[PDB]
Scaffold this active site. Sequence first.
Site, PDB file in Angstrom:
ATOM      1  N   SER A  37       0.823  -1.204   0.000  1.00 30.94           N
ATOM      2  CA  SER A  37       0.000   0.000   0.000  1.00 30.94           C
ATOM      3  C   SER A  37       0.861   1.259   0.000  1.00 30.94           C
ATOM      4  O   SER A  37       1.975   1.256   0.521  1.00 30.94           O
ATOM      5  CB  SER A  37      -0.936   0.005   1.209  1.00 30.94           C
ATOM      6  OG  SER A  37      -1.789  -1.126   1.192  1.00 30.94           O
ATOM      7  N   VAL A  39       9.503   3.180  13.660  1.00 29.30           N
ATOM      8  CA  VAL A  39       9.257   2.357  14.837  1.00 29.30           C
ATOM      9  C   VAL A  39      10.577   1.720  15.256  1.00 29.30           C
ATOM     10  O   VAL A  39      11.207   1.015  14.457  1.00 29.30           O
ATOM     11  CB  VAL A  39       8.195   1.276  14.572  1.00 29.30           C
ATOM     12  CG1 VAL A  39       7.933   0.468  15.835  1.00 29.30           C
ATOM     13  CG2 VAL A  39       6.905   1.905  14.053  1.00 29.30           C
ATOM     14  N   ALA A  42      14.196  -3.933  18.214  1.00 31.71           N
ATOM     15  CA  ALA A  42      15.386  -4.663  18.617  1.00 31.71           C
ATOM     16  C   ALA A  42      15.468  -5.977  17.850  1.00 31.71           C
ATOM     17  O   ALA A  42      14.479  -6.458  17.289  1.00 31.71           O
ATOM     18  CB  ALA A  42      15.377  -4.927  20.125  1.00 31.71           C
ATOM     19  N   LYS A  70      23.158  -3.460  20.073  1.00 30.71           N
ATOM     20  CA  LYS A  70      22.470  -4.144  21.163  1.00 30.71           C
ATOM     21  C   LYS A  70      23.372  -5.275  21.641  1.00 30.71           C
ATOM     22  O   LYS A  70      23.505  -6.299  20.961  1.00 30.71           O
ATOM     23  CB  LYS A  70      21.108  -4.680  20.727  1.00 30.71           C
ATOM     24  CG  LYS A  70      20.396  -5.446  21.842  1.00 30.71           C
ATOM     25  CD  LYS A  70      19.176  -6.193  21.339  1.00 30.71           C
ATOM     26  CE  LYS A  70      18.628  -7.107  22.424  1.00 30.71           C
ATOM     27  NZ  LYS A  70      17.604  -8.042  21.894  1.00 30.71           N
ATOM     28  N   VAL A 173      -4.261  -4.461  -1.958  1.00 31.44           N
ATOM     29  CA  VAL A 173      -4.794  -5.758  -2.357  1.00 31.44           C
ATOM     30  C   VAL A 173      -6.266  -5.799  -1.970  1.00 31.44           C
ATOM     31  O   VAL A 173      -6.610  -5.671  -0.790  1.00 31.44           O
ATOM     32  CB  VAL A 173      -4.017  -6.912  -1.706  1.00 31.44           C
ATOM     33  CG1 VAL A 173      -4.762  -8.221  -1.901  1.00 31.44           C
ATOM     34  CG2 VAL A 173      -2.620  -7.000  -2.297  1.00 31.44           C
ATOM     35  N   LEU A 320       4.493 -11.330  10.831  1.00 30.53           N
ATOM     36  CA  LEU A 320       3.374 -11.480  11.756  1.00 30.53           C
ATOM     37  C   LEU A 320       2.261 -12.351  11.183  1.00 30.53           C
ATOM     38  O   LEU A 320       1.459 -12.898  11.950  1.00 30.53           O
ATOM     39  CB  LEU A 320       2.832 -10.100  12.142  1.00 30.53           C
ATOM     40  CG  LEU A 320       3.499  -9.353  13.308  1.00 30.53           C
ATOM     41  CD1 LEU A 320       5.017  -9.313  13.189  1.00 30.53           C
ATOM     42  CD2 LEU A 320       2.936  -7.937  13.409  1.00 30.53           C
ATOM     43  N   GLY A 332      11.043 -10.795  16.626  1.00 34.69           N
ATOM     44  CA  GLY A 332      10.286 -10.505  15.415  1.00 34.69           C
ATOM     45  C   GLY A 332      11.122 -10.610  14.151  1.00 34.69           C
ATOM     46  O   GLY A 332      10.766 -11.324  13.211  1.00 34.69           O
ATOM     47  N   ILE A 333      12.247  -9.896  14.112  1.00 36.63           N
ATOM     48  CA  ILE A 333      13.121  -9.952  12.941  1.00 36.63           C
ATOM     49  C   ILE A 333      13.750 -11.336  12.809  1.00 36.63           C
ATOM     50  O   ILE A 333      13.971 -11.831  11.696  1.00 36.63           O
ATOM     51  CB  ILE A 333      14.185  -8.844  13.030  1.00 36.63           C
ATOM     52  CG1 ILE A 333      13.521  -7.464  13.006  1.00 36.63           C
ATOM     53  CG2 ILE A 333      15.196  -8.967  11.899  1.00 36.63           C
ATOM     54  CD1 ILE A 333      12.933  -7.083  11.654  1.00 36.63           C
ATOM     55  N   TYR A 423      16.106 -26.484  17.275  1.00 38.00           N
ATOM     56  CA  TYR A 423      16.606 -25.136  17.052  1.00 38.00           C
ATOM     57  C   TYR A 423      15.490 -24.121  17.264  1.00 38.00           C
ATOM     58  O   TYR A 423      14.422 -24.219  16.657  1.00 38.00           O
ATOM     59  CB  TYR A 423      17.187 -24.977  15.648  1.00 38.00           C
ATOM     60  CG  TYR A 423      17.706 -23.574  15.425  1.00 38.00           C
ATOM     61  CD1 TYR A 423      18.920 -23.168  15.973  1.00 38.00           C
ATOM     62  CD2 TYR A 423      16.973 -22.645  14.695  1.00 38.00           C
ATOM     63  CE1 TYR A 423      19.398 -21.882  15.790  1.00 38.00           C
ATOM     64  CE2 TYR A 423      17.443 -21.348  14.505  1.00 38.00           C
ATOM     65  CZ  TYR A 423      18.656 -20.975  15.055  1.00 38.00           C
ATOM     66  OH  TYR A 423      19.127 -19.691  14.871  1.00 38.00           O
TER      67      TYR A 423
END
Length: 488
Positions: A37, A39, A42, A70, A173, A320, A332-333, A423
């Site tokens: 279409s 923040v 860490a 980090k 979409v 997500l 998340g990453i 893992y």
Amino acid sequence: PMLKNVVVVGGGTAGWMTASYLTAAFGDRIGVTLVESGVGEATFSTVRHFFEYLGLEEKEWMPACNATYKLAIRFENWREPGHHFYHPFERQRVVDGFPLTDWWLREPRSDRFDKDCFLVGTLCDDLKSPRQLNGELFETQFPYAYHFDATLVANYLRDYAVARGVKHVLDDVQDVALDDRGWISHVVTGESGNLTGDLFIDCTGFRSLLLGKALAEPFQSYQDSLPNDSAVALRVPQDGLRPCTTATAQEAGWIWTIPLFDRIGTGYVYAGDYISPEEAERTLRAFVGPAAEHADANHIKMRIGRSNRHWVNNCVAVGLSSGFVEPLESTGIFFIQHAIEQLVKHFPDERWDDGLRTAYNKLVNNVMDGVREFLVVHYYAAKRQDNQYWKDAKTRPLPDGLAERLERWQTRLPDNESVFPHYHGFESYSYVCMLLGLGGLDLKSSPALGLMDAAPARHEFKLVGEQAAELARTLPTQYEYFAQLHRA
């Protein structure tokens, strides 16, 4: 026999990490199209390998993405009020077959295991850069990560991939069409026609328009074991340039502090059954202080869990849309990178071997289930039981196998053979660190240490102190290091 076209649906970090990685792996040998279409975020240890795979050096991308180092997570008020400890990206010192933390547990040298056994916590207290002014890392034993602006990283990777041939479609979409087999036929855009391809990557977030909606793949909730389902976030200027994420336990969750180079991202992850959104916002604003008085607060409902399958037919979910847990250990990453790396490894040809999907789905499910167990341990082993929320953290149903492992950890500290046996990113040293810091379990040192020679362990404790003092005297602060990069 090879596929000809990949369609990535959705941008952001999920979509552009996927698109950029596909160009680094396959080059011009397959077509990639992305349709879509700041923040502070860490990351976890493995992210160093993502940028290396693309050929990007830290000096190239970190300034453009407001990024910092980090080295650890600083955990505050999880054991008791006013107490903190570091979970460092620092692998174990092993002396005659026993980790230094085991020696420490037998005869604690201070109130702080992380001060006596690790270097990195002291580096964080002193705001240190991990690189010296001469450009060299101070040392791997230190699998560190970064803080960055996820929007700036998405734009950086977009430019990277588009310059190398990814087709970029800016549109919404409107629908996802299935063929007679139940495979993805095409995606209907608002004003660009229908995009079709061999493989579709769902990067549409919690909405999961391709996998969760069009293909109706069931989603397994983690909410029974991890009740935090909401977040409120805001952003303030840097005053804070500490090379670590801070996780400060609260009455119904915890507050993150993520330091960018001149911005701070902060938020309260909480359980809506225990506190309202307006009270979470009030707590967050009071925690940050006067800098947050006029900042805009962003409220978020989280979909906590994992899809039953992540590759179904010709669709793979990344980000997500595939699954999510609260960012307590900054996964998340990591989930995105693991999904992309394993997609390349299990990439299909035109025969679409179903065994590739089976293996891929098991690997992702094991990563997410393993992280879920690790996070449950954060709340279970946290010593605090001051209210119903922190009491309930010890009485929720545990994932399969965890009750047995908790008993093993109260015999000897976690090692490779006593943690979740698949893992899931985190190594055994992370379990040891969290258990010692959280303080809620009845831990015991190995009785064998009473019969061992103590000179090697005592030498190692002295060396850690001498190295920490040497590094405090030599290393520059992050600000000093970044100012030197800017001048160069």
